Amino acid sequence: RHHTDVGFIMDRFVKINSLSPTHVIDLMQTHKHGIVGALLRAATYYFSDLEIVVRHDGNLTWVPNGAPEAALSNTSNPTAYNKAPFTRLALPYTAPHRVLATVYDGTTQLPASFNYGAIQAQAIHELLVRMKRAELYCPRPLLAIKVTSQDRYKQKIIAPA
Amino acid sequence: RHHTDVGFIMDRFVKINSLSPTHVIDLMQTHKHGIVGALLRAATYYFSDLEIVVRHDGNLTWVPNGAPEAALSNTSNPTAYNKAPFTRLALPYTAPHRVLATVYDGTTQLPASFNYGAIQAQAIHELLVRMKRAELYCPRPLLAIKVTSQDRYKQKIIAPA
Amino acid sequence: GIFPVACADGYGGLVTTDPKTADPVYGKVYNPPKTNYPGRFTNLLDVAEACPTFLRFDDGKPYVVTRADDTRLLAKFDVSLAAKHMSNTYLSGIAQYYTQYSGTINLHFMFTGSTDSKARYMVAYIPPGVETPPDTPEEAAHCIHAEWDTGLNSKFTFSIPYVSAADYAYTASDTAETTNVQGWVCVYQITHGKAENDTLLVSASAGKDFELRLPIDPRTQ
Amino acid sequence: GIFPVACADGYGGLVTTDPKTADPVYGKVYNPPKTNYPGRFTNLLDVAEACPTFLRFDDGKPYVVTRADDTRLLAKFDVSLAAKHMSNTYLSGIAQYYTQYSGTINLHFMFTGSTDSKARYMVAYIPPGVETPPDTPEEAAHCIHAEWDTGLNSKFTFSIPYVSAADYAYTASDTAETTNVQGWVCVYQITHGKAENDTLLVSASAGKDFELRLPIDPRTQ
Amino acid sequence: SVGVTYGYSTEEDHVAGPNTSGLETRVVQAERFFKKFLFDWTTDKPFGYLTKLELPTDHHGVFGHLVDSYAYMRNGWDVEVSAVGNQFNGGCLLVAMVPEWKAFDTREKYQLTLFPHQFISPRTNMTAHITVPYLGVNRYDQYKKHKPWTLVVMVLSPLTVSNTAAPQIKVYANIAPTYVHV
Amino acid sequence: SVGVTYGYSTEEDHVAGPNTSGLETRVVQAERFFKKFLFDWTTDKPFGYLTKLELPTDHHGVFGHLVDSYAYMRNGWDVEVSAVGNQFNGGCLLVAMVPEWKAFDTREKYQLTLFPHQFISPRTNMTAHITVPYLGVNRYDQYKKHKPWTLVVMVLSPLTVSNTAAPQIKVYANIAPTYVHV
């Protein structure tokens, strides 16, 4: 047994669909079948450090949570400047809670708490994110692909010629 | 005696003819008189680690064997991004068998097993491959160039002027 | 007094699997240590040991239709890592994100009639290629088989040895050949005692052996 | 607090012979240790010791036409590292991928007539430039020679000393001169006893000395 | 009985601690059983018939008094479920301890038993018995806005009847917090 | 005789092992010699006359029963070849133990003796005797789809005759697996 202890699984990247001149940062922003979040969604409570990568322009800049967004461009809370083409940072946890989670039933919109935060620039294209030393708590249900045809399942396989 | 123990012979490169937007990866894809495979073909069973080099564009990306090809571009199982002009990776063995081989007589098409796999991109030109720490088992027959003329053989030799 | 700048000729790709790290920035920040919190785990496998599962038949009803009469054949399913019998299955989803896998597989059985009722049943393995499913307990037995009764126990867990071609196999199945990868491994029984309506349950799970190698997305992210 | 970036001025070529390594990616993966598997080896040389070889004559028949009458001359071949006498030869192909080579060379002989038949033969070396092949055993002997009989043995292995110009030589031969590199080293015999039809076999092989330096493709890859 | 089966651990706990714990000590007399109605269960319900119960309902208890006190709090939870019948019945029901309950969907039904659980059939059990140690986002909680837990049961086998049995069965359970700190 | 000559090793082997080995133990009574026809050999065949024999043929043996059982298996192989003649013959035949046999071609003929082997001439030998220890891709095998071995012989010298000898000779051999695990 030398896998499925997250310590090796969740240290990769995953694309994110959306962007804008500002853009919230969260895990549940991930696709709900990208192999990253499946395991993530497959659990109840999880914590990690955090690493992120952005291909961009202008001046990438970031703020931790619980902050007045209205005050980012000014006075430049911490950052380093432009350099193409790869740029790689890591943020440490900041949220007001000793653990994250996936969904919080309270009388189904995601709460306003679990917030790695957001970044801002003048031009933003590509996003890479990363989970460190993570751990998970109370795994949750999980699905596979659905069965439609008869036998067992069918699927194409690569092979040389 | 300080050669012909493969540990020095099979740690070089060799061109490969074909490519396509996807492209299987195998040793027997090599030319059957390139000095690399001769020794390789000169044997029955061989194992090694593996190192590969590709001059390319776009996003080189790779998957280990026993996988649904149909799912490569999405979700980006492991990879690093573009950078010209040299790019050098190494893959560790993955095949479902404790050893490779060259040819497997079963009632002459190569089996669907021995599969370092394949890579995919949007533009692919050049290929360099490499064998690590390799070992070989039950050497097989081997030929030289054929004799046509009379004496012993004749061949041009370089020399200054 | 420069040190020889043995520059890099073409390496160092920003790529996926990498183990390289980064620089804390608004860093040097503690957190209240999260020990003593419950629900800790590491292994998809190990948590898939204590937890059993369920199955499915075309009747969409998880339990087994368990006819109780002179019939001899009970019902026959299959166990792939990906098959209609075993989709909604805590293994497969966890599985279907992999290609190499190895080790034994687990099952369960839960009885339904009142304990008084005597009973007989017979789990039985079949290798992929016997070319004919058995049709009698003793000749079924030739491959693999065992027993129990209602007597002295109601639960049970069973296992098939991890037979294969090589000491590993493909998770998904192929569209280039015919023969089933495992068979139709299922159950027989000796004379039913008495029951107006039985029922059976069945699961799978990780155990000492369920292993994997790894990994790639299949899906259409 | 930068360390002096003693940058590289023009080195570090992505080139062939290099010993530099790479970074595992989907890495950290074991394998069942492959010890105790048979057929292990390392050396093309050493495996070319226990294994003998064969030869060829214009008759395309590997064995030797072995006339058995008043004739004195048996037949004469050559031993280059690349010659019509020795193409289909486990050495040469392995050889022809090299340029420098050194050390003694091996042979073999296997008899054909019934053991009762007395016999005589005489292996004999000739240096490249005697300007005349010998035509009598004792004057042939002047270079190098030896004996055996059918008596008390049937096999034999023989060797030529690695004479050369320098303590090495070219594998392929030249198209700028005439003199054969080695000679026409071949065999004589004393009176044949009796035989309706003999036959001889002959090989070569690695031994204590067969060595090389190295390497380049010749072929038209 | 099958006896107690624990959720994730079995141990005596920390009971006295810092400022708020000093301010919100183990008020033991806040503890008392009572009974809730669960659901009905006859030969009608085919499989998949879910029935959920959010927690915790109001209650005329000292606990219930404080659960309106609308304040930072923590708690424990001890579950003991049963349904009296008679040995001629037959089937299998599923009892469930769910963290962060969400509206399920057909396919995932077949997954329930991830959670701690037991089995429900008139042969093996007659007394479910299960306890969850506390958890939550904060070190404490304030209910009204949220529910960290729920107690759910759903079909796991169709139910059988002969002439000898009772064609209807009610299902009770036992709900009372423990280890309370306010 | 020249005596036994081994293929790659000479040693008593592992016989009892893990789950499948525990499930597929050394069924010793699965072992028994028998005889196969090889080929004919007169003054006709010039050099290069190949004649191959795939392995293993069907056989009315307990071994043969299981080799249809169509299952993961392993095996051993012991070869003992001969051809009775009389001391007035003359020539040289070549016996061959081939791993992963392929259709050869003229030039490579001159290479055979890479493999383990002996010589065939009425003087030196009268009894070939050779054993291959197991190998294969898997730790085990399932035959029908594949053949890891074959037993081949081909000319190595033209054959001579006088009046005293027998103008025809048949060639037998001995084939029986050993060390069987199923």
Residue numbers in the entry:
A (entry chain 1), B (entry chain G): 27 to 133, 155 to 208
C (entry chain 3), D (entry chain I): 1 to 221
E (entry chain 2), F (entry chain H): 29 to 210
Give passages from the manuscript:
Foot-and-mouth disease virus (FMDV) is a highly contagious virus responsible for causing serious livestock disease. The virus forms an icosahedral capsid from 60 copies each of the viral proteins, VP0, VP1 and VP3, organised in the form of twelve pentamers. VP1–3 are surface exposed, each adopting an 8-stranded β-barrel conformation with extended N and C-termini, with VP1 surrounding the 5-fold axes of symmetry, and VP2 and VP3 alternating around the icosahedral 3-fold axes. In the acidic environment of the endocytic compartments the virus particle dissociates into pentamers, releasing the RNA into the cell to produce viral progeny.
The dissociated pentamers appeared to be hydrophobic, since they stuck to the carbon support of the cryo-EM grids or aggregated. Only a small fraction of the separated pentamers dispersed in the vitreous ice, making it challenging to solve a high-resolution structure of a standalone pentamer. Due to the limitation of having only a few thousand particles (the majority of which were side views) this structure was determined only to low resolution (8 Å). For the isolated pentamers 4,260 particles led to a reconstruction at a final resolution of 8.2 Å using the same criterion. The density for the isolated pentamer correlated extremely well with density for a pentamer cut out from the inside-out shell (CC = 0.88), and at the resolution of the analysis no structural rearrangements were obvious. In neither of the reconstructions was density observed for VP4, so it was omitted from the native PDB coordinate fitting. Furthermore, no density was observed for the N-terminal VP2 hairpin loop of the native structure. Indeed Burroughs et al showed that VP4 is absent from sucrose density purified pentamers and our initial cryo-EM data on the reassembled particles was derived from material purified in exactly this way. This finding was confirmed by the higher correlation seen between our fitted inside-out pentamer structure and the density of the standalone pentamer, than between that of the native pentamer with this density.
